[PDB]
Each structure stands twice: as C-alpha cells, then as structure tokens.
Design an enzyme around this catalytic site. Sequence first.
Site, mmCIF file in Angstrom:
data_model
loop_
_atom_site.group_PDB
_atom_site.id
_atom_site.type_symbol
_atom_site.label_atom_id
_atom_site.label_comp_id
_atom_site.label_asym_id
_atom_site.label_seq_id
_atom_site.Cartn_x
_atom_site.Cartn_y
_atom_site.Cartn_z
ATOM 1 N N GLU A 151 0.762 -1.313 0.239
ATOM 2 C CA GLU A 151 -0.328 -0.081 -0.144
ATOM 3 C C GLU A 151 0.863 1.068 -0.480
ATOM 4 O O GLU A 151 1.478 1.134 1.145
ATOM 5 C CB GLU A 151 -1.100 -0.156 1.027
ATOM 6 C CG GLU A 151 -1.731 -1.053 0.879
ATOM 7 C CD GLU A 151 -2.698 -1.366 -0.483
ATOM 8 O OE1 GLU A 151 -3.446 -0.756 0.099
ATOM 9 O OE2 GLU A 151 -2.020 -1.522 -1.297
ATOM 10 N N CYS A 200 -0.492 9.778 3.707
ATOM 11 C CA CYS A 200 -0.546 9.231 2.097
ATOM 12 C C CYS A 200 -2.080 10.021 1.523
ATOM 13 O O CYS A 200 -2.144 9.769 0.361
ATOM 14 C CB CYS A 200 -0.551 7.922 1.977
ATOM 15 S SG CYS A 200 -2.155 6.543 2.924
#
Lengths: 107, 1216, 54
Positions: free
Chosen positions: B793, B827
């Site tokens: 991820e 993120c």
Amino acid sequence: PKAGGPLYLGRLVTTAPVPPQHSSVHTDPVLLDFAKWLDGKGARAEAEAARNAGSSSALGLDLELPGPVGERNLYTLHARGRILLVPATESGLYHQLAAALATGNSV
Amino acid sequence: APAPFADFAPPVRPQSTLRRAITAAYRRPETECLPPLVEAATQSKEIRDAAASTARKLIEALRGKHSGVEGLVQEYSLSSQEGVALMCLAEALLRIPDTATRDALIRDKIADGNWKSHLSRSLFVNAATWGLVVTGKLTSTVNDRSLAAALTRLISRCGEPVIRRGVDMAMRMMGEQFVTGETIREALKRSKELEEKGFSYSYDMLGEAATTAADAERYYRDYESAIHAIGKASAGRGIYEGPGISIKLSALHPRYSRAQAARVMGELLPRVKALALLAKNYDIGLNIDAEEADRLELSLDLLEVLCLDGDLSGWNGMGFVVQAYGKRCPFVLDFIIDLARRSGRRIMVRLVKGAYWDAEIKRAQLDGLADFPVFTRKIHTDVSYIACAAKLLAATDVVFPQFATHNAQTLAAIYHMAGKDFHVGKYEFQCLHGMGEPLYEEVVGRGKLDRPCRIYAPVGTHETLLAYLVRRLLENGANSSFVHRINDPKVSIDELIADPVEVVRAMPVVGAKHDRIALPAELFGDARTNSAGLDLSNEETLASLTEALRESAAMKWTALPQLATGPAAGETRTVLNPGDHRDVVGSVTETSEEDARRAVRLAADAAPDWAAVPPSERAACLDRAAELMQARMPTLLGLIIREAGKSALNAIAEVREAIDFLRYYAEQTRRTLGPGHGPLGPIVCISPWNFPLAIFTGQIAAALVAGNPVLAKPAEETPLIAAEGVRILREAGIPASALQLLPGDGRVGAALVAAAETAGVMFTGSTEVARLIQAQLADRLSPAGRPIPLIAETGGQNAMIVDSSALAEQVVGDVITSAFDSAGQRCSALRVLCLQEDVADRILTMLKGALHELHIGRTDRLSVDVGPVITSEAKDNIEKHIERMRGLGRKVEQIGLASETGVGTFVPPTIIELEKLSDLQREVFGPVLHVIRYRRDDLDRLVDDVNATGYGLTFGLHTRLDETIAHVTSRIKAGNLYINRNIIGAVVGVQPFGGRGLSGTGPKAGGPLYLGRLVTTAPVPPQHSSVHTDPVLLDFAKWLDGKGARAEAEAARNAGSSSALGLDLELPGPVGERNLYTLHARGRILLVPATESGLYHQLAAALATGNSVAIDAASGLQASLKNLPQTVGLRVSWSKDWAADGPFAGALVEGDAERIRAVNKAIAALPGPLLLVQAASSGEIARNPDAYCLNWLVEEVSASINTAAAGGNASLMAIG
Amino acid sequence: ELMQARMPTLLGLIIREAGKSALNAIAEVREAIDFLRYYAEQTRRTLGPGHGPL
Ligand SMILES: Cc1cc2nc3c(=O)[nH]c(=O)nc-3n(C[C@H](O)[C@H](O)[C@H](O)COP(=O)(O)OP(=O)(O)OC[C@H]3O[C@@H](n4cnc5c(N)ncnc54)[C@H](O)[C@@H]3O)c2cc1C
Ligand SMILES: NC(=O)c1ccc[n+]([C@@H]2O[C@H](COP(=O)([O-])OP(=O)(O)OC[C@H]3O[C@@H](n4cnc5c(N)ncnc54)[C@H](O)[C@@H]3O)[C@@H](O)[C@H]2O)c1
Ligand SMILES: [Mg+2]
C-alpha cells in the site's frame, strides 16, 4: 416510441417537447472521448454539439412509475443499438456521430 | 527548551464554580438532564389550561389567515422540478443588474427558447435551496439534468409569462422575505411600519465563519457601518424600544475556536469591544448570536470580559443567546445571571432553541464522543426552553429575557408563566423576519396580548442570504418544526397545543435518548464498539489531558528487538522530537540483520502453536488490545505527539484508528475464519512512520488474527509508539513468539523480506521501496512453489476537483485540512487542487488567506495546527521540490515560520500554482499543495490528467451537480473517493482505505477482503457477492461451448456467478454521510498461460471480474482463441513486449515452479505499478476451481459523500 | 368520461363484435379511457406554441 409512454406525443409534432421526467445524469463515455477528439482537431462547433448531446441525452434514465401496490413498474432508456449514418458532409457526420454516441449507440 | 506540554491548553481564566457546572453538563446523559427541567417548567393546572387556551387561540388565528410559490406552481401547472428550475432561472436573471437589460433578455432570448445559450456557472447551483422553498424537502445535491429538462419544458410550454412571474416572485422573496432589506438603510426604511405597531428590530448583517483576516475585517466594517445606521435611526429610543444589532463571533475572526483561545482573546475581543463601545454611544442593543456547541464556553470568556470592562459601563445593551437545545443551557443561564449581578449589567438574554441540531449530531458521532451536547428528542428541547424561561423570569431585575420562538405553545406557556404584571423592558418575545410576523401580530399590541416582539431582521444581498438559507429554512421547515406542523392539515390544534412538560413527565423513562439516533459508541451496532475520542473543547478534558500528556513525557520510552526469546542487544540511539531535537523522547535499540533472520526462524517454529489458537480467541486478543489502547489513549497521544510531529487532534485520530483496526479485524475474523483458512505462516509487517500506531497496528493485527506469527518492523523514525503497541498486544494475550518487534531501518525490513521462512509481506510505505520489496520477492517461492503474497500500500498523487457550484468556504476548509494537516504527511493528503477557471481566483485568494492563519510549531500546544516534517532529509527533499518549482517560475505562497521552529525540522505550508498536472513527477510527502486551473469543458481531459499520473489513492470532488458527480466518479480511477468533504477519511470499515496503480496492490486495509489475503484459502467475506454476471464472460462461455470446451465453459459460468464484480454496498457510519463500497474491474490483467485449458481458465477468471487481458504472445497459444465474439475480442490483446503494453492491474500465471519464478521476475521488472500476481500449475488449475482467486481480480472503491454539505441533513429532518 | 359512463354498452358491442369475454372487454374500454386521459395529461405537461402539428 411506445404507446402509453412519455415519448409518444413528441413523434406527432414537428419539434419534440421534453417529456416529463426525461433526463439522465449519465454521460456516455464514448461521447466524451469523441468530444475531446473534436476539440483536439479544432472542430469547436462540433465539440460543443457533442457535449450538448451528451448532456441532453436521456440514456440511462431509470424510473419507477406509479402503479398498484405489489408491483414495481420500471421504465428505462437504453441505447437503440447500431444506427445507420448517411452523412453528406464532414460536419454532418460529426453531428450524426455526436447524436448517436450520446445515446449509447454504435454506428 | 520549554518543558513538554507545559503550555498545552491553559484556560483563558481559572474556571469558577459556575463555569465548572457548565462544563460538567456538556454531554450529560439525557435521562439526567430532563427531570430538573421538568420540575422547573411545571406550572399550575390553571396556568396550563389558560396556556392551552391562549395557544389554541393563536393557532386558530394563524390557520385562519394562512402561497406565493404555491400559487405560481398552481397557475402554470408546474411540477416540483419545474418550480425549482424556474426559481433558479429567476435567481440568475436577477444577477443581471440593469432592469431593462434583463427584460430584453427575457422577452427576446430566454422566452424564445435557448435559455442555456444565454445563461461558467450552472443555473442550478442553488437548486437545493429552491428545492426546500418549493417542495419543503432538502436534497443535498442537485439533479441539474432534470432541472435543465424541466426548465426547457416549462419555458417551451408557458413562455415569457411564467418567466416574468418567476422573476417577480424571486425578486420579492430574495429582497423582502428572506431579508428585511438588501442594505441596512433599506432594512431600516422597511422597519418603520411594524415599529409603529409595537415591534422592535435586531439586524443580522448575515456575516458568519470568516475564513481569512480580510473576511473578518469586512464583517467588522459591515457591523460598524450597520451600528451607525441603526444608532442614527434609533435616535435615542434606547435598547428596548429601539433597534439593535446581532453579531456572530465567528464572523470577526478566522480562527474562532477553543484551540486558538489566546488569539481569540487577544484579537477578537478588542473588535467586539470596539463595536460594543459604538453600540453604547448610540444606546442600542448588541447581541452575540450563539453558534456551534464547541464555541459556547469560549464565548462566555468574551462575555465575561466585556461585562466587566469599565469602558462599557452605563450601557445595558449587551446581549447574548443561549440555546435551550443544549444540555448546558440552565447552567449557562446561572452563569450569565450571576455575571449580570456581579457586573451590574442587565444582560439581554435571548433564549432560543438552537439552529445547528443536525450538525451537532454528526459532529459528535464523527468525533466518537460520549454523548451529544444537545438533546435528541425535540420535546426535550421544548421542556428545556420552558424550564430556562422560568429561570429567566425569576431574574428580570438583573437580566432582560428575550424569548425567541415561533411555537405558539411555547409562547403561550411563557406568556402565562410571566403573569399579569408587565412593562416594556421586563422581557420581550422575538421572531424571525418573514416567518414570525403572522404569529406575533396576534401578540403585539393592546388589542392582542400587549407583549413586545423584536424581529430578527436579516440584511444582505442575494449572494449573502443564499449562503446559509438552508440552515435557516430547516429551523421552521423540518417535520418536527412548529411552522411546518401549523401548515400540515393532518396535525390538529390539540396536537399543537400539547404540553411538552406534561408529556415528558408521563413518559416511561423521562429523558430517554431518541430511539433512531445512535450514540457515537454505537455507530456500528452489534458488529463492534466504535472507538472513542476526546473533546478538546471540554476544559475538564483539556485539564486531565494536560496532566496525562506531561506524565507521558516523563516516561522512559524504549523500543528493543523483542525476539521470541526475549529482548536482544543491538545499536542504541535516542529518538528526538522532530519539532525540537532538544526534546529526547526515548531510545531505540535496532535489530541486527542476524537477529532479524533469527526472529523469522523463531516465528516459523512458533507458527503451529499460534495457528492452533482458535480464531475466536485470537480475535479476543485483538479486542482486549483495543480496550487497552482506549484506556491508555492519553498516554499514547503524548508519545505520538512528541515522536511523530502530530497535533493532539491527529494523535487522537491515530489511536482511534488503531482501536478500530483491532476491533474490525476481530469482528471480520468472527464472521469468517474457520479450520480450512490456514495461515500463510510468518508474515513480515513493514510500516511507515507517518501513521506510526494505526497502520502499524492494523497490519500486525490482521496478520495475527488470521493465525500468522508476525515480524513487526516499524519505520526507523517512529519505533517508540510501535514498541508500545507491541507491548499492549502482548499484554492482551498475543504470545511473544507470535509477535516480535524488530526496530531498525530498511536493512532490517529487507532482511526480513529475504528470510526463507517469510510466508507473506504486508508493506505500507513509499512506492519506490515497495518496488525494491517486489524485486526481492520475485526471487522467492513458497515451499509449495507459489509466489509469496505481498500487500503493498503505497503513495498517492491525490487530486481534488472543484467546480463553480462548490461553496468556497467549504472547499477552503477541506483543502487546508487535506493538504496541510500533519504537514501533508498523510498518504491521503491533497497534492493537486484543480479549480474551475471561473472561480479559481476567488478560491485561491481565500485559500491563501486561510493558509496564513495556520500556526506551525512544536505540537505539544493545542494552538499548533501544523507540526514538523519527520526528518531533516524529508525537509531537504520537500524544499528541493519547492525550489525547483520556484525556479521554473511558478507562483509560490508560503507561511512565515516562527524562530522557535529552528530547533526542529519544519517546512511551511506551501501553495504552488502549476500550469499542467504533468509538472509533477512523484509524490512529494510534505505540506505542498499544487493548484491547477481548468475550463469547464475540459473536465473530462482533466480527469484523464489525474489518472495519467499512475497513482490512484484518494480523490475529492466538490460540486453540487449530479451530472458532474456522475461524470467524474465514473471516470476517475482511485480507491478512495470523497464528495463535498476532505479527502483524508480512512474510517476503518466505513471508508476501507487503499488505492490502485502506483498507490497499491490491495486488498484495502480496513475492508472485508483484507484478512482473506493472509490465509492460504480465502474465506467468503461478509456481504461479498453479486447478482450481476459480466456479459463478456457470458459471451466467452458460449464461445467455449461452441468450441467444444465443455468443462471450461462450465468453469467460466461458475466464475461468472462466483465473481463479486458489481457488489455495491452502503456501509454503516455517521449521519450526514453516505459511505459506499463497490467492486469494479481492476483493469487489464496480464495473462501468462502455458496450456490451452489454462488460458481458458485464466480468461474466464479475468473476464468474470470485468477485466480486459493482455495474453503473453510467447505462450504460442494464439490458435486457441480463434473466432472470438467481438465482445470478447474487444477485451483481448496479445502482448509480445509486456513492458510496452502496460500498466497492468494484476497477472495470472500458469506453469511449474521454475516457470512461475521466471515469470514473477519478468513481471517485477515491468515499469510502474506493482502487480498482484496469482500463479498456479496446470495440475492445480485442473484440480482446484479456485486456483485463481476472484477476490484479487476486482478492485475495491470506497466513496464517502457528505450529504450535509448543502447546509442540513434531510434524513434528520424526520427525526424529532 | 363518456366512455367510462357508457362502458356497459361498449362492453356489449366489443363482446359480440370482437369475440371478447366480459373481463377482456372491460380491460379494452379501460385502456381506451386511460389512453385518453394519459395523452391529455402528457399534453398538459408538454405542448406549447413551438410544438407544431405534422
Ligand atoms: C429571533 C431569533 C433569533 C435566533 N438566534 C439564534 C442564534 O443566535 N443561535 C441559534 O443556535 N439559534 C437561534 N435561533 C433559533 C433557531 O434559529 C430556530 O429558529 C429555533 O431553534 C426554532 O425553535 P422554534 O421554537 O421557533 O420552533 P420549534 O418547531 O418549536 O422548535 C424547533 C427546534 O427544535 C429543536 N429540535 C428539532 N428537532 C430536535 C430533536 N430531534 N432533538 C432536540 N431538539 C430538536 C431545534 O432547536 C429546532 O430548531 C433564533 C431564533 C429566533 C426566532
Ligand atoms: N497507501 C497507504 O495506505 C499509505 C499509508 C501511509 C503511508 N503511505 C506511504 O508511505 C510513505 C511514507 O512512509 P515512510 O516514509 O515511512 O516510507 P518508506 O518507504 O520510507 O518506509 C516504509 C517502511 O519500509 C521500510 N523500508 C525502507 N527501505 C526498505 C527496504 N529496502 N526493504 C524493506 N523495507 C524497507 C522502512 O524502514 C519503513 O519501515 C509515503 O509514500 C506514503 O504515501 C501509504
Ligand atoms: Mg524512508
């Protein structure tokens, strides 16, 4: 168009009205790609006609119509299928393509 | 160096007994609030009968004289959409200033047909407001295609006459009904008529929620100019007979909040004082309106200073609103009455019910707080109001009560409570202009009840009034609202005159919460307990948190290599606060590469014992760890704040997310895992620094609960909170052999990944590092000869698109939060803001103004908005990017940093205006927002540009227009979409989080496919199915049958049914939001077959999940796919150069072990995204119908839609 | 309105001329009534001066 449906009367006048509830929030994605292509080559009026067709097309309309209990009566607008295009001019072809693509059709 | 947390959140003043009683009631259980209110509101039977008779008389008068929009709809036979569209057209025509110009456009252009050709901004931007006017219903977004069709239809049917009538109606409503006047002078002229009858006025200049210093200055000078006009007009009538002004504190400072209390007292207070001095000189009222619940107590500090300020003495015009829907109301009144006594100022107290109910419910749910700060049953607010009126009526010698209400029952109850003795100045009623006059014309005057009413009179232009008209309409337009009910013929007068006091008193449980409103802890019902937050506006919480945070800074935090055998020795160094390197947070001992390899072997040895703990007991460990983290939250906050540069708000969210991961994966385990879902084995969990507890805990908890022992490698920057999370998990019952902590840098991560017993890797971090891990694993196969599963991820290049229908203030708040919260070190952070050209300058100006109100500094102060960047290397990398952009000529806006930042590593929040999205190369993980502008017709191209980066993590869209929502969300390729809200939402199980492309392999963390990746045979997740069958799959199955491949055709049909492509669910969450979860195709899957049957199985799997394919041409299997139906051919390409034909979104590989290994290496070498590869032997394809798992051939998409963005909550309009 | 009021007589004619049962003759007359009222309402919703007849 279907008898007993909202598009019927519009066939019997020289300029069709906008029927009740006749719209869709969906825009055909191939229409969108066509409009970008038209603007790429500077066909500004045609790209505008393409965008307008994309918005005014009711492709994707999906309604439940009032009726009796214990039944769901649904009415949906889909593409016709493959449309025969018989253009004479480049601009005419672009306008025909815009109308057909905006309504989900192949040509 | 200042001591940690020594100045965290000191109150404005020491909290008196009266102030503490307010704070104590903030979220008091509703069953505790009501009994004393019932007692205080009780009146004699004779009074109740007289009140009911008065109420009935008022209601009979109201219904007897009871249409403009209704008459227009009737005259022209308009549908609801036609009525709305007509009013939107009228609004647009009224933006044309010259009357003759407008009439000419109407007669010659609009009526003739093409209204679109003559009117960069949708006509329908405010259609939600007009929908409320026309239909009484609030729809959060606008169906602009339906409205356009309706407008064309109505104009073509009815022509100029209907347009004329619409324009005249809108002109009257916007100029005379929603406002008393467009300007204070106009409003004053129109006030004389009702003043002559005994009404008074309080003017509302409609300012609210300043976003910038310039906004606050504008609202200031508007209030000052209004005070002059009102004071000149008052002409010595005084504060009771004469007009006054109402102000909102949020209009006068862009950071009006408890977190910024010092700036509020230093900067906002003098402005209020200056306005109050002017009101004093003219002897007019100046009322402070009440706003959100988290501003109530802060406003009391201003009221206190103003009432004690001798420069204001001699004037009794200071006024203050208290909201009876709030649980603190009676205690606030006690405080105000006492302040009035101490100061000798006869404070004007406006008692209202409250205007922000829906928003208070949503906010408390989002924040995970113990309870609501408002009542949840409308009747409770009514009883509160009457009880508080009783308190005020006993204090008329020291305060001036002002009873603002449109409810005739409320009014009658107070009229009789107040008794027969009356004089002007004892008390008054209040009502809203253009709403309350029908009722109060039955009250004011010697021929009526001979009680005065002050009309709250909005003043402003069309733009100003439309901004928050939705909230103002819901006050009297919701199904529970008196004004709605008086107009409902199904509601009898007996129902309207019902006494709320006696009704509440007779209830089985007095004061029970509304049955249909979930407490924040109960948002997920029986599935799991929501994590709890902390209220940073609560002084008790701030005081207790201050002590807990200070105590956390005195702890000797360490992180050690915690092997199964015990702590290991290694290289030890301090961990320094990134905001101030002088603040040593703790010490980390880092793991040798030899000990990392040893830990994997110990994990392998211990794998059977941990797999044998039943899933229910493993989940119980996670739940116990969640309870421990919840109890330890304050201490965990302090560590996160100092180790990771987080503010308190962000640390709270970080700990809540960890708790939610633990409870979510525990519940998902209880729903799914059985004996046949065998663990992979030792899983290496490698986590990033920036969510140092939440992501760390999430990966480990998932792996552990799936039965795998874990090697936990936290980021080198943030080992301490990771060590504490491991300690908590071990305390909760995770054996040391099942959870080993291995602090250190990327070398430790790489050594773990490379270890032969490593059976799976969970990585969250940068795309570039994931690519290195991908390369390491391409060398490796499991003992069964299959690829080692990798969840990777990775980074984002996250965009938000804003069109001209968005509300700039909302956009700017969501942009400031999304781009600069945590210094952009999320993120999910917003990296590219895309502004429609027609609004870009206005939004950019507002954004830059908001940027300059941020406080950057060491995060152990509540007043700090933006903390440091994690390291000097991160700072250098971000600044190199900023200077490159600056060197290219791009306009760069930066906050000035305080000198105190020099001891840490800070980068100022930065706005960079770009020409093209191609100006960005890679993710810049810092507080750097890029801004691009786009023309409306180029929206589709812009979405292409966003997709063209290759990332696909978070994406935001701000628009009111359904056509734009449908277009953009259908074309964007990102894993987490957000509509009309910020783009940082990752609420576990609500916005399952994770992207595609360069942003992730999936499955999403916090989603239902996650655990299934961590076992050898994936279970069926809850709710995971789809009734839809991919039509190309169906065509392929028929083609297979036509070719005689009967078994493969059957397998294809089975894949079509088994596929969950088309799953479309709404996930439970907070009110005012719709959180959707859908399964889509991944994209183009690379197929590397070895046999014809293998190819058919691979194609069936890929097509059943909606994908296209690129088939390895080196397989030589071209002749196996002759004469495909065109529908299937459109999805099939053949690839001789895989690197040229990507990016792919996954791969399916057939072969023996060494073929799989070779292919895996070739796949890892492809440029761009990491590919989720599934491999199987030909024999496995023959034996196992699930050889290729369909879970990993779909793409999860989460979409979070703020349905309160139009100004209110439609669904909650029916909750009373 | 006239077809609704005269439905019993119309039924008799439809039964004998077109081979319909009573139930199907009722459905036939109802459908005619519904067409009349539906196209009337659709007209009231749509037709204006620019929608000229063929
Ligand atoms: C002149 C004037 C000035 C005002 N100034 C302010 C102000 O500065 N700040 C402010 O916040 N409000 C203010 N208000 C009040 C607010 O704007 C609404 O008008 C008021 O709350 C409606 O109460 P009502 O008695 O007129 O109507 P009612 O129909 O009697 O009451 C409606 C109210 O009940 C409450 N309510 C509805 N549902 C629930 C529920 N399920 N649970 C608990 N409570 C519920 C809400 O407060 C709602 O507004 C003012 C009102 C007036 C008339
Ligand atoms: N998609 C998501 O959910 C998500 C969430 C948070 C952060 N991120 C991304 O994480 C990044 C920021 O975190 P970071 O700076 O800690 O990332 P990073 O890539 O620098 O480090 C991540 C982890 O990998 C380890 N590591 C470094 N090199 C390694 C190697 N060669 N082999 C094995 N492990 C190695 C590090 O020690 C650390 O534990 C950003 O790019 C951000 O976008 C993504
Ligand atoms: Mg790094």
